[PDB]
């Protein structure tokens, strides 16, 4: 009869037909990953081809239902998800050219040698532990001069092809296509816009500049001791001394920048070894931690089907920590586990992912995913955040029950956390701003590197050691840039993580500093979380966010409240040192 | 109340519960089997205490009492469904199975038994041998079976017998694998319906019957209904064995 009723019938048929195909494709993928042979690759390729062909045909079928007729707002979401054209709007020759460009860029990034040394792990070890100016400069410059020079011509055609594809789908540019994820419309009082994500990110960043400036000044003052005359007390930090190839993470700078080096950290690896933990107690303890909050247990097949240890010498597998949701009520974890603290925290992270995947399994097929990009990883991360506290360790049994907690230990812990969390927001913000500007056409093709380095000096406070001409492509050296991955999901995730943590700690009635908060043995926090987890993609991300923190937008105040002792100590320490950087100074 | 007497028919054959429950192959839910079991003595105590059933829910009867009641007829309906759909096998519920596949009336007297079958109906790859009806114009009336395979039309355009745009084949298959969840695993369901009519009772429990007395005030239990009084050969009960008619008199 009406368009809505026919759409509902079509959606029933599609869901029933699609669940089994997705399950079979996932089974083939798991079979290849656990057992690497030449037979399994063909099975993966065939299953993927079948699934892709089915999805394309069903999208073409679903395009026939006009979207103005449906007013249910839940049928409309699934029809909108199916109706997306994608890159098929391009001509056959243009599509082949775009796919060839992407494959060539990925292949050339993957196969890169410096003469020889590969990036993994020959160059990474040099950039992580050289402690020598000349060697670090050579390693930093050679990789750029090879890859960025070899990748510059391809990116220029990539940009215009992607812009044509995005403008064909009624968007302004490809950056607008990326921003379309954070969009809510048709709901009164919870609206959001693609152009509103340009704002609400700058606003959040202008509230982080004091803390980052103090951290940068402290790190520069501490790093000046290692290299006597290569760093200026008013200039920026050279790009090849930040403990990374790109400077994305400052974690490797922890060894030089320790507040109190005499006092060690909390490492419970020896306690785990002496108590004879054997890669199965870790996941049982994680399950206990998740149950104590009120969330359910692991399913019966999770224990027997999943892989929690290396296959052995005879069987080879690519075992990175991963949580698999194969469909039809099948959840597993693929991971090689050894007895350390890092694996103990990764178990909680992966089970946070798994418990997120269990909640919205009652939603239709197309609405079984997180509310937006940052919700899934933030939910995963808060569990690992709460499971590492000394109180939680003492309650479990590992770490002595008469541990001495003082100011020095918490300052060391907070600095180690901020060298990873705070030190990466400016990089993400600057890189995504540059990509958006390039896509929008505001940056001309002849002023790419100049604008990139000017933005890096003005925002990140980092200068280049040697000048780079327009034949270089420094941004393409990053894995995400050349491999076509969105990068703003590492900003909203960081903000949502602390918003969720503060809301849950307010639900658990914890008194004191936020960084000592623990969420175990509390069921109200579990209910508050599960009210949002079960929603899936059915409700707007603003509404799902409101169910935990009570706000319709992301805030930076929890992030600054987490790091208050560190901010006060840094402000005390930087009384003599200069705060801020000057863009005129250069190493040459 | 000097004596107590109970009178039941002298049937000795055992009911074929094993043939229904121990069956080699079951049936699709859209085309479910019906078996009538009669002229036998039924012992539901062993069936209840077998303790191998995930679901044993009796509506309108008591689980222990029904052992000594006499029913005119007993019907058993057997099929296979998904683990999550067993919820819909109950009076006054809605769903794809309770609307288009199998409907139980609200005034239902009987029992529902369901047990897991993952070790028999699941194979590597997939079963794809158990179907169920997905589309239908109208809901199924209680205890009605539909086995037509006509093409369902969703729009105004006529189907002309070949599927296409807004033309679907209703019967879609169940896919069972040994790695699924509990809610996606096969379950075998047997529904027992007890029918009482004005005809003499035929299916009864295993309760021994004693001799009858007359002209004295005794407690009698005929074919399930009890009373106290004097039985006189002639408010009126007809005993099963000796075909006599007795009148009940207050004492
Ligand atoms: C892995 O594959 C090899 C050959 O394909 C086979 O011999 C072996 O049994 C497989 N192992 C598992 C655990 O499937
Ligand atoms: C949308 O349709 C679903 C069934 O598909 C129904 O449960 C829901 O109430 C409908 N919403 C509105 C607003 O009509
Ligand atoms: C997808 O492309 C087809 C091609 O003509 C067009 O008719 C349709 O409106 C497009 N839909 C969307 C959502 O872009
Ligand atoms: C949680 O409660 C249990 C008692 O069931 C107790 O043994 C454990 O120490 C508690 N842990 C925390 C962190 O409060
Ligand atoms: C069915 O088979 C089992 C296994 O042999 C047996 O114990 C049982 O008595 C049989 N009949 C019923 C009604 O369960
Ligand atoms: C059972 O009862 C019937 C009723 O008339 C009778 O004909 C038959 O002989 C009885 N059988 C036995 C073994 O008592
Ligand atoms: Zn994660």
Residue numbers in the entry:
A (entry chain D): 19 to 133, 141 to 613
B (entry chain A): 322 to 555, 574 to 590
Give the exact sentences the study uses for this entry:
Here we have examined the structures and receptor-binding properties of spikes of the B.1.1.7 variant first described in Kent, United Kingdom (now termed Alpha)10,16–19 and the B.1.351 variant first described in South Africa (now termed Beta).
Similarly, we also show that the Y453F substitution in the RBD of mink spike, a structure of which we also report here, only increases affinity for human ACE2 if residue 614 is a glycine but not if it is an aspartic acid.
